[PDB]
Write a structure and sequence with these properties.
Layout lengths: L11 H14 L3 E4 L4 H14 L2 E3 L9 E3 L13 E3 L16 H12 L7 E9 L8 E7 L2 H10 L1 E2 L1 H7 L6 E6 L20 E5 L4 E5 L10 H17 L2 E3 L2 E6 L5 E7 L6 H5 L9 E6 L3 E5 L5 E4 L4 E5 L9 H8 L4 E3 L2 E2 L5 E2 L9 E3 L5 E3 L13 E5 L16 E9 L9 E3 L3 H9 L2 E2 L13 E2 L12 H13 L8 E5 L19 H11 L6 E3 L2 E3 L14 H8 L3 H18 L5 H14 L1
Parallel strand pairs: 1-5, 3-18, 4-9, 6-8, 8-10, 13-24, 24-28
Antiparallel strand pairs: 2-3, 5-6, 5-7, 9-10, 11-15, 12-13, 12-14, 15-16, 16-24, 17-23, 18-23, 19-20, 21-22, 25-28, 26-27, 29-30
Helix pairs in contact: 2-4, 9-10, 9-14, 13-14
The structure holds guanosine-5'-diphosphate and manganese (II) ion.
The site of manganese (II) ion (MN) has 5 residues, from α7 and β17.
PDB class: lyase
Keywords: kinase, GDP Binding, lyase
Assembly: monomeric
């Protein structure tokens, strides 16, 4: 195809693969992306010409755009996401599995001719800092320009990644199509997609095949498909960890930095914590990431984290100058693509929770929206901003260092109205794994439906594991067993969402979570107490710095209470979950569960 002839690499495996894909999908032309600022502008000008992008008032925003999607293509589709390992047991009970030969036959049928009437982009990229010994590289082939521009922000895309591949370097093969072939002469739509959607991962060959969605983690294949699904399977095989964790640098009033990694499920506070503004005099906070952490042991035996991503793909609604000024400042520097937010009368963007009460807006469907009248949200409730990390004012200077940052503490947490204390320190590594493995959160989904349950979401990875959950637990246990336990991060479990009898929050959270992290630091520095309980070490209210905090000590005590009775009721929920994990549940997790049972009596 034209002009693969004119392509800036001698990597023959790449060229072949591009040719084989093009022969199948039959695009009008193939274009290799270089990631320059020039190309970005051209792509964006095209997308504006197509009507997919609206340019935002340049007086208010530097080089920014609003994109609106088809309302059928508005989120990740977990019921259409598949781990297609050779054996169903290697996908495991948390994944949808399909026999790989079966899946290939479905997807090859779907891909045949699917790019008719479009450009096929070949997008090389790097996950992690460019300057690594063996960086993790990929190529995404896509027929969406939206995808290319988003990939440019969310990954290290283009010329530099293509050069790192050399002539025979390995890379992850990622194929994407929106699945909306055009007939000759046919007018295209602003957001092409298909009613048939598949997001498929082949862990053994390290390939991702996506079809039919233009949106988010369905289409930006670095963001979840590579960074967690494929990466988790590589990490399992190569001796490291790919996780759903923010990375936070906390700096004490003396001049000491502590790095923490925290795994909360979506909607449980990762973005807030990752951009924490501490409330205790002299403490500062910087971010390395609010989503993905890749972690590996160094020569000295410590665990080092790196963010593989290069941008933030944040949920917009709720974001404002009070809730997250640092997120706001990042967006204010421009170079941002908003997806599915509302457009103001002066060509700015708005969404629910932002300052102002615009009386009229154009909503994310392109319809007129009116204050105290229009029954639908102006911004889609899961709309996004896509912005460069380098614009974040509290970004840590080590954010682009390939050797990463040494982790002191790993935090697990989710939303629990009852039972789980504000903070608890694990007893050892194995116990740590167990706390992670049984993380519970009170949240449910539209097509889960019912309602008040406690979802189990092991390390915050329920939708993202690239292999059997039991073998993942084992992998965590093994990394601990084979390490020097003095160099290992300590493990904590937090809960910001415990409620009193009248149902208010016992803990105020947000900035004040800096006080919980201070206890954690103090435990690392042998400066704070905590009582041994059935579920781990938990501070008394006296062990915590509440100086300056306008809250009832009775509330804090209640937020910290470990009640044997509540915990006994938790045990059959946990038991059901561990039975679900099935035959690959490790003995180590069952042993911890037996220990927990013994201590609760
Ligand atoms: N009560 C309470 N709510 C919080 C806290 N941190 C975040 N939230 C809320 O939980 C939701 C999710 O926060 P976000 O930080 O975007 O979580 P993410 O999806 O994991 O990034 C938002 O409605 C936040 O206001 C906290 O410490 N306490
Ligand atoms: Mn977030």
């Amino acid at each position: 195809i034209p002009g693969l002839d004119t392509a800036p690499t001698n990597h023959q495996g790449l060229l072949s693969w591009v040719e084989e894909v093009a022969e199948l999908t039959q695009p009008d032309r193939v274009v290799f992306t270089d990631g320059s600022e020039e190309e970005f502008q051209r792509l964006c000008d095209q997308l504006v010409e197509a009507g997919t992008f609206i340019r935002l008032n340049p007086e208010k925003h530097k080089n920014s755009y609003l994109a609106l999607s088809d309302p059928s293509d508005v989120a990740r589709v977990e019921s259409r996401t598949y781990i297609c390992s050779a054996k169903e047991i290697d996908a495991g009970p948390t994944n949808n599995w399909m026999d790989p030969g079966e899946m290939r036959s479905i997807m090859k049928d779907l891909y045949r001719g699917c790019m008719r009437g479009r450009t096929m982009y070949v997008v090389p990229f790097c996950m992690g800092p460019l300057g690594a010994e063996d960086p993790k590289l990929g190529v995404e082939i896509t027929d969406s320009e939206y995808v290319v521009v988003s990939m440019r922000t969310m990954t290290r895309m283009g010329k530099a990644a293509l050069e790192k591949m050399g002539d025979d370097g390995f890379f992850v093969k990622a194929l994407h199509s929106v699945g909306a072939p055009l007939e000759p002469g046919q007018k295209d739509v602003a957001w092409p997609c298909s009613e048939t959607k598949y997001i498929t991962h082949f862990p053994e060959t390290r390939e991702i095949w996506s079809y039919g969605s233009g949106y988010g983690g369905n289409a930006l294949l670095g963001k979840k498909c590579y960074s967690l699904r494929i990466a988790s399977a590589m990490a399992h095989d190569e001796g490291w960890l790919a996780e759903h964790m923010l990375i936070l640098k906390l700096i004490s009033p003396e001049n000491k930095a502590y790095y923490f990694a925290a795994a909360f499920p979506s909607a449980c506070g990762k973005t807030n914590l990752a951009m924490l503004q501490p409330t205790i005099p002299g403490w500062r906070a910087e971010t390395l990431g609010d989503d993905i952490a890749w972690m590996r042991f160094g020569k000295d035996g410590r665990l080092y984290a790196v963010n593989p991503e290069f941008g933030f793909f944040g949920v917009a609604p709720g974001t404002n100058w009070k809730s997250n000024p640092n997120a706001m400042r990042t967006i204010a520097a421009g170079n941002t693509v908003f997806t599915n937010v509302a457009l103001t009368d002066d060509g700015d963007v708005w969404w629910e929770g932002l300052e102002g009460d615009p009386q009229h807006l154009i909503d994310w469907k392109g319809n007129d929206w009116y204050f105290r009248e229009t029954e639908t949200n102006a911004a889609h409730p899961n709309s996004r901003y896509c912005t460069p990390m380098s614009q974040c004012p509290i970004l840590a200077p080590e954010w682009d260092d390939p050797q990463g940052v040494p982790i002191s503490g790993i935090l697990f947490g989710g939303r629990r109205k009852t039972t789980v204390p504000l903070v608890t320190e694990a007893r050892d590594w194995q116990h740590g794994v167990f706390i992670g493995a049984t993380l519970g959160s009170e949240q449910t989904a539209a097509a889960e439906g019912k309602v008040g349950n406690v979802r189990r979401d092991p390390m915050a990875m329920l939708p993202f594991l690239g292999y059997n959950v039991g073998d993942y637990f084992q992998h965590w246990i093994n990394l601990g067993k084979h390490a020097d336990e003095s160099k290992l991060p300590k493990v904590f479990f937090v809960n910001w969402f415990r409620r009193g009898d009248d149902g208010r929050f016992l803990w105020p959270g947000f900035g004040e979570n800096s006080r919980v992290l201070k206890w954690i630091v103090d435990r690392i520095e042998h400066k704070a107490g905590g009582a041994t309980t059935p579920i781990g070490t938990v501070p008394a209210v006296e062990d915590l710095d509440l100086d300056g905090l306008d809250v009832d000590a009775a509330d804090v005590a209640a937020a910290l209470a470990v009640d044997a009775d509540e915990w006994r009721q938790e045990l059959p929920l946990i038991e059901e979950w561990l039975q679900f994990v099935g035959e690959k549940l490790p003995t180590g997790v069952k042993d911890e569960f037996d220990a927990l049972k013994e201590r609760l009596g």
